[PDB]
């Protein structure tokens, strides 16, 4: 009921009714676990399916484990934290749908942040919100540029190995902002470059490009 910091699960829950969550939380604390202060401090994400919530899409880049709530129920039953293996989230439908293995995503996340050394400019009208995209980009190691980059900035990033790659993200409602960029032959991608990219831990410069 009281463990060392490196032995304490820091848990996020996603996709549950408020009352279920209340109950899971009581159980968690009795066991000496805690609710995570944020994705970045989370060790375990509890989810019963692959679900594209902000929690899932930030957590996936940092957590050690994505498990079903059955894990926590068995832990509480045994009054100890048991091994995660038998409770790893396996969503056959989502995996076929998005052509990935969640296990493979976690492995890649641990090796390296998907957006290591990448800067994103994201137009203001984006959906989900700019704040959401930003939190997802950052957990994955990227940075979001607050100012729209000039043609000069874009070229200079490309010409210097010492400078991060810049990636532009937009949506239908904002494409008028990018007209001059397209004329220049600059790529702009839709939000899925980030959303689906982080879920599957892949960079896909072709599926989501407006060009």
């Amino acid at each position: 009921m009281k463990l060392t910091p490196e032995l304490t699960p820091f848990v996020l829950f996603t996709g549950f009714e408020p009352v279920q969550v209340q109950q899971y939380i009581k159980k968690l604390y009795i066991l000496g676990g805690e609710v995570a202060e944020s994705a970045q401090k989370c060790t375990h994400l509890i989810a019963s399916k692959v679900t594209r919530t902000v929690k899932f899409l930030t957590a996936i880049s940092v957590v050690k484990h994505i498990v079903t709530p059955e894990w926590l129920e068995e832990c509480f039953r045994c009054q100890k934290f048991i091994d995660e293996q038998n409770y790893i989230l396996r969503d056959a439908e989502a995996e076929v749908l998005f052509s990935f293995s969640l296990e493979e995503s976690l492995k890649r996340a641990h090796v390296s942040p998907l957006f290591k050394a990448k800067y994103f400019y994201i137009t203001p009208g984006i959906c989900p919100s700019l704040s959401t995209m930003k939190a997802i980009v950052e957990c994955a190691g990227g940075k979001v540029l607050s100012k729209q980059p000039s043609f000069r900035k874009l070229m200079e990033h490309k010409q210097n190995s010492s400078l991060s790659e810049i990636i532009l993200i937009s949506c239908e409602n904002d494409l008028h902002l990018c007209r001059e960029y397209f004329a220049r032959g600059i790529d702009v991608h839709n939000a899925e470059f980030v959303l689906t990219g982080v879920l599957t831990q892949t960079l896909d410069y072709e599926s989501y490009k407006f060009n």
Partner: peptide, 10 residues
């Protein structure tokens, strides 16, 4: 839709 607490999927 009625407002709810549910976490939105994207």
């Amino acid at each position: 839709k009625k407002a709810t607490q549910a976490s939105q999927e994207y």
